[PDB]
Design a protein around this nucleic acid. Structure first.
Lengths: 53, 54
DNA sequence: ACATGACATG
DNA sequence: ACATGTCATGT
């Protein structure tokens, strides 16, 4: 991850979520990701994905 | 308005950049489970992820 | 590049 | 009210 030559750019993920859900993600971002919400969203999505398989 | 009084919550925008590989995975899940509705797949996935945390 | 939203079509 | 995308502005 992070910066390096040829690294593929990220793609826009845009969706509507419940207020409570977005708030949990924001709190999580402030405590673990330096308030970077999109970073927090990826970590949580990754955690959600391994629960699928 | 009405639905509001009974607890129906208006959804809010979550906009973030994701690695192309992860999006392909959210999309494959949307295909298998939500009739390709990526937003709905993202909610279900995010919820499972949040359930870990707390 | 990336992070956030405001615009902008179906 | 949703779903998805592209612009635009400040990092």
């Amino acid at each position: 991850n992070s910066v390096f030559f040829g690294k593929k750019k990220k793609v826009s993920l845009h969706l509507l979520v419940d207020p409570d859900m977005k708030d949990e993600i924001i709190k999580y971002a402030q405590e673990k990701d330096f308030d970077n919400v999109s970073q927090a969203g990826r970590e949580i999505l990754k955690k959600g994905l391994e629960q699928i398989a």
